[PDB]
Nucleic acid binder design. Structure first.
Ligand SMILES: [Mg+2]
Ligand SMILES: [Zn+2]
Ligand SMILES: [Zn+2]
Lengths: 73, 1335, 99
DNA sequence: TTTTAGTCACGGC
RNA sequence: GGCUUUUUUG
DNA sequence: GCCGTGACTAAAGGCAAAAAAGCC
C-alpha cells in the first residue's frame, strides 16, 4: 500500500540514506523479533518500515540509540 | 579482502613457484578409456583429481583420505575444483622471446635497447647475427652481422669478439646491460643536445629506464625461459556425442609447442648439425608466438577449418573476449523475457505479469512460504506440489507478490529510464502487460517488441527499486526538466475531442449548477459533449501562505471542459482546462501540477487523464475514411498554370536567352512555389467548415474532419504528412542529392504511376540505409562517452572557489537560439550579480537559481549572469555539489554520491539516433545600435568607418537586452552612430563581399615611390578594357633580387611626413602584395577610407569528431603571443613571422605558407589568439591560446548548435562534464622545485595536489599547461589499468602497465564492477566512505 | 521464457543462454550503466555476484530465501578469477594485495 | 572499405 | 557444448 | 644535417533475441 516515497525522502536528507536506514530497520524487523511500531495492513517488511520513517518515529539516530541501549544489556 | 590490484612481470622463479608439476608429454587423454594421461596437458598428478575425493587409481577415496597423497597413482586426494586453480609449467629447451613486448605499438625491446624493431625481428628469426661482446675489435656492441659477415669477421679477430644468434643472444645482451648507468648518460646527453625530434625519444627512454629501475623488474625477465600452463578446467575437453571429442583451440597450440620443444630437446642432445638446430629453434619460436598471440606476425596458423585459431591474447581482446562478455555484462538468473502488450486498466506503478512467468520467476520464494505453513515438509514435496499446480499455490503466489517489485527492461537501454521497477499484477496469458504512459520512456511500440523482467532478492535491492527505480519516482528526464509521462496518441485525441466547442449543438446556452450536472446531461443525452454553456465552478488557489482558499464564479465554457474539470486537483486554476488541450498543452498542464502540488497529486492526475482520455476517445468513434482526405479543387488548375510556366522556359531555353543551369534553377523555383501554393490552399480548405448557427445564418467554425483532428491535436502526424496525403508530394531528390526537375504531382489519395513511384523510392531507400547504418555508429559513440567519464562522482558540498564561466544568451545573427533564462536555470552564481546600477547586489553569491528567481531575473531584465561550472571546480578526484548545480531528474540540489558522469554520457548519447549520417546586414525589428570594443572614425563624407577587428553589432530595446549580433571586416560602413535608437528594416552595414579592399588609413595625397619600370612593375594596358594603370606583376618574371623589393606605399600627410596618429609616429607603409591592380591614378582625390586596389583571393560524425577533438583537414592559423607584428628573412619554404613583446625577449619564430590567405598586415598590432588565416578552428590551438575557460564554451556551443538544429533539447551542463574529462592531463614545462620532468605529462589533479601542498610549506611550486585529449585517448591514459584494459587495446595497456609495475587501487566505477564490489556512487557511496575512513 | 535456477556453463559458471538450454537473460553493459545512473549499488552487486557466477554466494542465497531471510554475501565472482589465471597464463603477473 | 593515429624511411636547402 | 556461416524480429 | 614530408603498419567500427545448418 505504498505508491511513492516523497514523504520519507523529505523526512531524511537524501534518498540513499533513506534506503540504508529503511534496509537496516527492515532487517531488524524481519530476521528476528522487533515488532513494528505501526499497525501493519498485510504489508511486506520493506513497506512497513518506510511508513515508520514517514511518521517521523524512525531515522538513523533513533536506530543507533536503540541499538546502543539494547547492546548495553 | 584486497586493497588493490598490482601488476608486474613474472620471474622464472615465480613461474616455477606457481606451478605444481612439469608438463612433458603432448598426449592429452588416453582416447581409449575415459582417463587422462600421465604428465600430459590434462595430467591428474600435476593439476588434480578428476573426481571429488577420488584418486586416479582408486586406492584412496572418501573424506578419510583427504589431504593424503596416494602413492599408487601419485595424485593427492582433494576436491576437484582445484583443477580450476593449480597451474603447470613447461621448461623450454631454448630461450624464447615474448611476442607482446617485442611488437606492441611502441616496441619495449626497441626502446630499452635503443634498437630499431626491423633488425631485431631479423635477429630473432635466425637470419642475421648480432654482436654480444665487441671486446677490443673493430665491431660495436649493437652491431648486426649476417652469415657471410660473421664468417669473414670470425677468422680476422678469432674469439676476441662474441656474437650469438636469436633469443639467446637477446637475453645475453639484456642481462649484461646496466640500467642506472645508461639512465645517467641518457640524462647527461639530454641536457646537452637540443633536438625536438630527439627530445621526445630521450624522454621516453629515460622514463622507461626509471620505471624499470624503480620497479623490481629486470630486462632478462622479458625473455621467456619457462612457460606457464593454463589450468585444464578453463580449457575443458568436454565429451560430445560420438567418438570425437570437443577440444578448444588452445589445446592444439599447447600440443604444438610441447611437441616442438620435445623435438628440439631430443635433437640438440644428439649433437646434430647447426643447420637443423637453427631451423628447429626458429620453428619453436614461431609456435610460441602463435600460442601467445596468433596473427600479429603474419599468416596465422589454422586448423582443419582453415580458420585462425584462438590464442590467449585473442581470447581477451575483442567483443567476444572475457572483459566485454563475461565481466562487464553477464547472464543472470531470476529473469524472463516476453512480448509486451498494452493494458489501459493499470496504474502507473503496476505491470501485468503472466501467471506462468510469475510462478517460474518466484519459485524460491514460494518454497519458503509453502514449508513455513506446513503444507510441505521436505523441499522435494514442495517441488512436487508446485509442478502439479495445486489451488493453494495460487493463493501463496498472490501473497508473495504483494509489494515485491520487478525490474522491467528493454534492449537497447539507451538511457536510465530503460530499466524501471514495477509492482507486478498476476494476469492470464503469456504477454507482459505494460502501462501506456511509460511507453514514451521505454521507446517501445506494440508491434512485436520484447522486454525482460528481473527480480530483486535482498531487502536492500527491493528498497532501492521502490525508492529509486519505480516509475512513480521517474517522471522527469535526467537530460532536461521536461516530463516523461506526457500523454500521446490515443489520449490526446480523446482530450482534444472532449474540450472543443461547436457553434451549434444539442442543449446550448443552458446554465448548470456545477460540473457534476454536466456529466448527468451528457450521459442522459440531453446535451452534446461540447455545447457552450454557463456553469458554476469552485476553484481553489494557493495564493495564501501554502493554504487553499475557495472561490466561486460563473464561467462560460462547454460540457466537455466542465466534465474534465472533475478530475483536475485542487490547486490548479480553471484557465488550464478551458483551451483545446492539444498535445503540447496537456503536458504543460501536468507540468503545472508538478510545480504546485508535488508528486502524488501529479501521478493521480496523470492516471485520471489517461482514463478519461481513453474513455472519451472510445466514445467519439473517430475514424479515417477515403472521403476524409479532402483534395483542394483549385489544385489541378494550379498545376496546369505551373506547367504553363515551364512551357515558357523550355521555349526560352531554345532561343538562347536561358542557359542550362539557370533553366534548372527557374524550373525548381517555379515548382517549389506551385507546391507551396497547393499546400496552402489545401490547408485553408481542410481547416474550416460551414455550419448553420442557432439564428439560421451560416457561420464558419474550425472543422471536425478526422484527419485534421489527428494532425492539429498533435496525436499523430504533422503538416508534411497531411500535405502528402492531399497536396502534391513535391520535388524528389536523386540518390546523389540532385533534385529531379519534374516533381511528383500526385498525392497518395489518388494513384501514382509507375515512373513517379520509382523515383519516390530513391529517398526511401536512402533513409532506410542511413537508419540501418546509423545505429552502429551512434551506440559506439555512447560507449566512448561512458568509459571516459565513468568515474566522476559528486564528493563535496561546496569547493569554495570563485572561478566560473561567463554565461550569456547565444546569438547567431538572427533570433536568439536560447534565452539566458534556460542557460542559467538550476545553477549557482560564482559571485554576486551586480545590477547595472552601481553597487547593487541583485543575486547573493553561492545561491541556487530556480524558476522563482529566474522570473525575478526576467522582470528586472538582467543582461548576463556569471555561474559556476564543473570544468572550473577545484575539487580533487571529483566535483562538488554546488559547481554541478541542480539535479534535473529530482528538482532539488544534487546529493553527495550521485554518479553524474554516466548520466551525462547517456544524456549526450541517447539522442544520437535522431541525427543523420549524411553582402549586407539588415535589422529585423526595433532596437538601438550598440557596438562593443568599437573604434570608428568619421570619414570625409561623414560616414563612420570602423578600424577595430572585434566590433560587435548589438540591438538594444527599451529594456536593455540584445537580440542581434553581427561581425564586420576592416573598414566597415555605418549609416548611423553609436547609442542611437534606430528602427527596423534599415540597412546600416554594406561592404564588398568577394574583393578585399586595399583602403588607406587617413586622408592625404598618395605618392608613388620605389617604382621600377621594365622588370618589376609595368604599365599593362589590357586590350579587354583598354585602360592604362599601374599594375603589380606576378612572381614568375621577377627573381629573388626583385621579389625582395617590397613596394611600400608610405602613408603621408599634406606635409609629406609620417602620419601623426595619436600615440605612435611609425610610418604606415602599405606593402603591395602580388596580383595587385591599381585602378586609381595620381592626382585623383581619395575619400577617407576609400579603396586603393581590389585584391582578389555533418551531424553524428561531426559530433563524434568534435568530442574526439580531431584535427581539421585545413586548420586555421592564429597568433601565438601578443605584441607587434614583425617579419624577417623570407622564401625559406614558408613565410617568417616574429612577434616582439613590450619588454620580454622575442626568440620565437614560426612559418606560415605565403601561398595561403593572409588577413593581417605589418602595420597592425595583433593580440594573442587572434585569427590570421581562415577555416575550421582546431581545439588544441584555441586551448593553448585563449585558455581553458574558452575551449569549454566553444565545444558546448558547437555541439548544442548541432543538437538544436536537429531539434533535440539537452542541458548544457551534461556537455561540460565530458569536457572536464578531456582536460584531465597537464604538460609540465618547468621542473622548478618539484619532482616532475620538464617534458612529461602528469595528471592535473596529481600536479595540483603536489603543488598546493608543497607551496604551503617553506618552498615554491611549479608551472604547468593543461592539455586537451580526445575521449578515445583520454580514456586509455588513466591512472587505472583495469578500466583502460577493458575498453580498447588490451594488449598495449597490459604490457605498458606491466613494464612500469603499476597498481590499481579501485577508485572508479567500472573497476569496482569488474571486481564485484559496491560501486562508490549512490547507495554504495556511504559504505565506501566508511571503508576509506577506517583506512 | 523464464528461469529461476537452471544449468550453468562450464568455464565461467554463468547461466546458459537461449530458450532451448533454459538460459537466463543477458544483463549487458548498457544495463550496468543504467543501474549506475541511479544510486543502485546493492542491485548491481546482486546481478553481478549472487545471481550470475558467485558459486559460493548463490548456493547460500538460495538457502537464505527458502529460510525466509533476504540477505546476500558479496563473495567473489568466478568470472574474474579465471581472467587472472588467463593473464597469469602469460608472462604477466597480476595479483591481489593484503587486507 | 574507411578512418585514424603512430612509426620508419626519404628529402631539400 | 563450444565455434562458424546464413535467415528473421525489435 | 635537421625539421618537413611520404610511405608502412596496427586498431576499430551497436545492443538483445530467436530459427536453421555444418565441424570439432
Ligand atoms: Mg517496434
Ligand atoms: Zn591413488
Ligand atoms: Zn566546486
Amino acid at each position: 500500500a505504498r505508491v511513492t516515497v516523497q514523504d520519507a525522502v523529505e523526512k531524511i536528507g537524501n534518498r540513499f540514506d533513506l534506503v540504508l536506514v529503511a534496509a537496516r530497520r527492515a532487517r531488524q524487523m524481519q530476521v528476528g523479533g522487533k515488532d513494528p511500531l505501526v499497525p501493519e495492513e498485510n504489508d511486506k517488511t520493506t513497506v512497513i518500515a518506510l511508513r515508520e520513517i514517514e511518521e517521523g518515529l524512525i531515522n538513523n539516530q533513533i536506530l543507533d540509540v536503540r541499538e546502543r541501549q539494547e547492546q548495553q544489556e | 579482502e584486497f586493497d588493490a590490484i598490482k601488476i608486474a612481470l613474472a620471474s622464472p622463479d615465480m613461474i616455477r613457484s606457481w606451478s605444481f608439476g612439469e608438463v612433458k608429454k603432448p598426449e592429452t587423454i588416453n582416447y581409449r578409456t575415459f582417463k587422462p594421461e600421465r604428465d600430459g596437458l590434462f595430467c591428474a598428478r600435476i593439476f588434480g583429481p578428476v573426481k571429488d575425493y577420488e584418486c586416479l587409481c582408486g586406492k584412496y577415496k572418501r573424506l578419510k583420505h583427504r589431504g593424503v597423497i596416494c602413492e599408487k597413482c601419485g595424485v593427492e586426494v582433494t576436491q576437484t575444483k582445484v583443477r580450476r586453480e593449480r597451474m603447470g609449467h613447461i621448461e623450454l629447451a631454448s630461450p624464447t622471446a615474448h611476442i607482446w613486448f617485442l611488437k606492441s605499438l611502441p616496441s619495449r625491446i626497441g626502446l630499452l635497447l635503443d634498437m630499431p624493431l626491423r633488425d631485431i625481428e631479423r635477429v630473432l628469426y635466425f637470419e642475421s647475427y648480432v654482436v654480444i661482446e665487441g671486446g677490443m675489435t673493430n665491431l660495436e656492441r649493437q652491431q648486426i652481422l649476417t652469415e657471410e659477415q660473421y664468417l669473414d669477421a670470425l677468422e680476422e679477430f678469432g674469439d676476441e669478439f662474441d656474437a650469438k644468434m636469436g633469443a639467446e643472444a637477446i637475453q645475453a645482451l639484456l642481462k649484461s646491460m646496466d640500467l642506472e648507468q645508461e639512465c645517467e648518460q641518457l640524462r647527461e646527453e639530454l641536457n646537452e643536445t637540443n633536438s625536438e625530434t630527439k627530445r621526445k625519444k630521450l624522454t621516453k627512454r629515460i622514463k622507461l629506464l626509471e620505471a624499470f629501475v624503480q620497479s623490481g623488474n629486470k630486462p632478462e625477465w622479458m625473455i621467456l625461459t619457462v612457460l606457464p600452463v593454463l589450468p585444464p578446467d578453463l580449457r575443458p575437453l568436454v565429451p560430445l556425442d560420438g567418438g570425437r571429442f570437443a577440444t578448444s583451440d588452445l589445446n592444439d597450440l599447447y600440443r604444438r609447442v610441447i611437441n616442438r620443444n620435445n623435438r628440439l630437446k631430443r635433437l640438440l642432445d644428439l649433437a646434430a648439425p647447426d643447420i637443423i638446430v637453427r631451423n628447429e629453434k626458429r620453428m619453436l619460436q614461431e609456435a610460441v608466438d602463435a600460442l601467445l598471440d596468433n596473427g600479429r606476425r603474419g599468416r596465422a596458423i589454422t586448423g582443419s577449418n582453415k580458420r585462425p585459431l584462438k590464442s590467449l591474447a585473442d581470447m581477451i581482446k575483442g567483443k567476444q573476449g572475457r572483459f566485454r562478455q563475461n565481466l562487464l555484462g553477464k547472464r543472470v538468473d531470476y529473469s524472463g523475457r516476453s512480448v509486451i502488450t498494452v493494458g489501459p486498466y493499470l496504474r502507473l506503478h503496476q505491470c501485468g505479469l503472466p501467471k506462468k512467468m510469475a510462478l517460474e520467476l518466484f519459485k524460491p520464494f514460494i518454497y519458503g512460504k509453502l514449508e513455513l505453513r506446513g503444507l510441505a515438509t521436505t523441499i522435494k514435496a514442495a517441488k512436487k506440489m508446485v509442478e502439479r499446480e495445486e489451488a493453494v499455490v495460487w493463493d501463496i503466489l498472490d501473497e508473495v507478490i504483494r509489494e515485491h517489485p520487478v525490474l522491467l527492461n528493454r534492449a537497447p537501454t539507451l538511457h536510465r529510464l530503460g530499466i524501471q521497477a514495477f509492482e507486478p499484477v498476476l494476469i492470464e496469458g503469456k504477454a507482459i502487460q505494460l502501462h501506456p504512459l511509460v511507453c514514451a520512456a521505454y521507446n517501445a511500440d506494440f508491434d512485436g517488441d520484447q522486454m525482460a523482467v528481473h527480480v530483486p532478492l535482498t531487502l536492500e535491492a527491493q528498497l532501492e527499486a521502490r525508492a529509486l527505480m519505480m516509475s512513480t519516482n521517474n517522471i522527469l528526464s535526467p537530460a532536461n526538466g521536461e516530463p516523461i509521462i506526457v500523454p500521446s496518441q490515443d489520449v490526446v485525441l480523446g482530450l482534444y475531442y472532449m474540450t472543443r466547442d461547436c457553434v451549434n449543438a444539442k442543449g446550448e446556452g443552458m446554465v448548470l449548477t456545477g460540473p457534476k450536472e454536466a456529466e448527468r446531461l451528457y450521459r442522459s443525452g440531453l446535451a452534446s459533449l461540447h455545447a457552450r454553456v454557463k456553469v458554476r465552478i469552485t476553484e481553489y488557489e494557493k495564493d495564501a501562505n501554502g493554504e487553499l482558499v475557495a472561490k466561486t464564479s460563473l464561467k462560460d465554457t462547454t460540457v466537455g471542459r466542465a466534465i474534465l474539470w472533475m478530475i483536475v486537483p485542487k490547486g490548479l486554476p480553471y484557465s488550464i482546462v478551458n483551451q483545446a488541450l492539444g498535445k503540447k498543452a496537456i503536458s504543460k498542464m501536468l507540468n503545472t501540477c508538478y510545480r504546485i502540488l508535488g508528486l502524488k497529486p501529479t501521478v493521480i492526475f496523470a492516471d485520471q487523464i489517461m482514463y478519461t482520455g481513453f474513455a472519451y476517445a472510445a466514445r467519439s468513434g473517430a475514424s479515417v475514411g477515403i472521403d476524409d482526405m479532402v483534395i483542394p479543387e483549385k489544385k489541378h488548375e494550379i498545376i496546369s498554370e505551373a506547367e504553363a510556366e515551364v512551357a515558357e522556359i523550355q521555349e526560352q531555353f531554345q532561343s538562347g536567352l536561358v542557359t542550362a543551369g539557370e533553366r534548372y534553377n527557374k524550373v525548381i523555383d517555379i515548382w517549389a512555389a506551385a507546391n507551396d501554393r497547393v499546400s496552402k490552399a489545401m490547408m485553408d480548405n481542410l481547416q474550416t467548415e460551414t455550419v448553420i448557427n442557432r439564428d439560421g445564418q451560416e457561420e464558419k467554425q474550425v472543422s471536425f474532419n478526422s484527419i485534421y483532428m489527428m494532425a492539429d491535436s498533435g496525436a499523430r502526424g504533422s503538416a508534411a504528412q497531411i500535405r502528402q496525403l492531399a497536396g502534391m508530394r513535391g520535388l524528389m531528390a536523386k540518390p546523389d542529392g540532385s533534385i529531379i526537375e519534374t516533381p511528383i504531382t500526385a498525392n497518395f489519395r489518388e494513384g501514382l504511376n509507375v515512373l513517379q513511384y520509382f523515383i519516390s523510392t530513391h529517398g526511401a531507400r536512402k533513409g532506410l540505409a542511413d537508419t540501418a547504418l546509423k545505429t552502429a555508429n551512434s551506440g559506439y559513440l555512447t560507449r566512448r562517452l561512458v568509459d571516459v567519464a565513468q568515474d566522476l562522482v559528486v564528493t563535496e558540498d561546496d569547493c569554495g572557489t570563485h572561478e566560473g564561466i561567463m554565461m550569456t544568451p547565444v546569438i547567431e545573427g538572427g533570433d536568439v537560439k536560447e534565452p539566458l533564462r534556460d542557460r542559467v536555470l538550476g545553477r549557482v552564481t560564482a559571485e554576486d550579480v551586480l545590477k547595472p546600477g552601481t553597487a547593487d547586489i541583485l543575486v547573493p553569491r553561492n545561491t541556487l537559481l530556480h524558476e522563482q528567481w529566474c522570473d525575478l531575473l526576467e522582470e528586472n531584465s538582467v543582461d548576463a549572469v556569471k555561474v559556476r561550472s564543473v570544468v572550473s571546480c577545484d575539487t580533487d578526484f571529483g566535483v562538488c555539489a554546488h559547481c554541478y548545480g541542480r539535479d534535473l531528474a529530482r528538482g532539488h540540489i544534487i546529493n553527495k554520491g550521485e554518479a553524474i558522469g554516466v548520466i551525462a554520457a547517456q544524456s549526450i548519447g541517447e539522442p544520437g539516433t535522431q541525427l543523420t549520417m549524411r553582402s549586407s546586414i539588415q535589422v529585423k525589428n526595433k532596437g538601438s545600435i550598440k557596438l562593443s570594443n568599437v573604434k570608428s572614425v568619421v570619414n570625409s563624407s561623414g560616414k563612420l568607418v570602423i578600424t577595430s577587428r572585434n566590433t560587435e553589432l548589438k540591438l538594444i530595446d527599451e529594456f536593455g537586452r540584445t537580440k542581434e549580433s553581427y561581425k564586420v571586416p576592416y573598414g566597415a560602413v555605418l549609416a548611423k552612430g553609436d547609442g542611437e535608437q534606430v528602427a527596423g528594416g534599415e540597412t546600416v552595414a554594406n561592404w564588398d563581399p568577394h574583393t578585399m579592399p586595399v583602403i588607406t588609413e587617413v586622408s592625404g595625397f598618395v605618392r608613388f615611390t620605389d617604382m621600377i619600370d621594365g622588370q618589376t612593375i609595368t604599365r599593362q594596358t589590357d586590350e579587354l578594357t583598354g585602360l592604362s594603370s599601374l599594375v603589380v606583376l606576378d612572381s614568375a618574371e621577377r627573381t629573388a633580387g626583385g621579389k625582395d623589393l617590397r613596394p611600400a606605399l608610405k602613408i603621408v600627410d599634406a606635409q609629406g611626413n609620417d602620419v601623426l596618429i595619436p600615440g605612435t609616429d611609425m610610418p604606415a607603409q602599405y606593402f603591395l602584395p602580388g596580383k595587385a591592380i591599381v585602378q586609381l591614378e595620381d592626382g585623383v582625390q581619395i575619400s577617407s577610407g576609400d579603396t586603393l586596389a581590389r585584391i582578389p583571393q555533418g551531424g553524428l560524425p561531426r559530433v563524434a569528431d568534435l568530442f574526439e577533438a580531431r584535427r581539421p583537414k585545413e586548420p586555421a592559423i592564429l597568433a601565438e603571443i601578443s605584441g607587434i607584428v614583425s617579419f624577417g628573412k623570407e622564401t625559406k619554404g614558408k613565410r617568417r613571422l616574429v612577434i616582439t613583446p613590450v619588454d620580454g625577449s622575442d626568440p620565437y619564430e614560426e612559418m606560415i605558407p605565403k601561398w595561403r590567405q593572409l588577413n593581417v598586415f605589418e602595420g597592425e598590432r595583433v593580440e594573442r589568439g587572434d585569427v590570421i588565416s581562415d577555416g575550421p578552428e582546431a581545439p588544441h590551438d584555441i586551448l593553448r591560446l585563449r585558455g581553458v575557460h574558452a575551449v569549454t564554451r566553444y565545444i558546448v556551443n558547437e555541439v548544442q548548435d548541432v543538437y538544436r538544429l536537429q531539434g533535440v533539447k539537452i542541458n548544457d551542463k551534461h556537455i561540460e562534464v565530458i569536457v572536464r574529462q578531456m582536460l584531465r592531463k597537464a604538460t609540465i614545462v618547468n621542473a622548478g622545485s618539484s619532482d616532475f620532468l620538464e617534458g612529461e605529462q602528469v595528471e592535473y589533479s596529481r600536479v595540483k595536489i603536489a603543488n598546493r601542498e608543497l607551496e604551503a610549506n617553506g618552498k615554491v611550486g611549479a608551472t604547468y599547461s593543461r592539455d586537451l585529449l580526445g575521449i578515445t585517448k583520454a580514456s586509455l591514459a588513466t591512472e587505472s589499468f583495469i578500466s583502460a584494459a577493458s575498453f580498447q587495446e588490451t594488449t598495449r595497456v597490459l604490457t605498458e602497465a606491466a613494464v612500469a609495475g603499476k597498481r590499481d587501487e579501485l577508485r572508479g566505477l567500472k573497476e569496482n564492477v569488474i571486481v564485484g564490489r559496491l560501486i562508490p556512487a549512490g547507495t554504495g557511496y556511504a559504505y565506501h566512505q566508511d571503508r576509506m575512513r577506517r583506512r | 521464457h523464464a528461469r529461476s535456477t537452471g544449468s550453468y556453463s562450464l568455464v565461467t559458471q554463468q547461466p546458459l543462454g537461449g530458450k532451448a538450454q533454459f538460459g537466463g537473460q543477458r544483463f549487458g553493459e548498457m544495463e550496468v550503466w543504467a543501474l549506475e545512473a541511479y544510486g543502485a549499488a546493492y542491485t548491481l552487486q546482486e546481478m553481478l555476484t549472487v545471481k550470475s557466477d558467485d558459486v559460493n554466494g548463490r548456493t547460500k542465497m538460495y538457502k537464505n530465501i527458502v529460510d525466509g531471510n533476504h540477505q546476500m554475501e558479496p563473495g567473489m565472482p568466478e568470472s574474474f578469477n579465471v581472467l587472472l589465471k588467463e593473464i597469469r597464463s602469460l608472462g604477466i603477473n597480476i595479483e591481489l594485495e593484503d587486507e
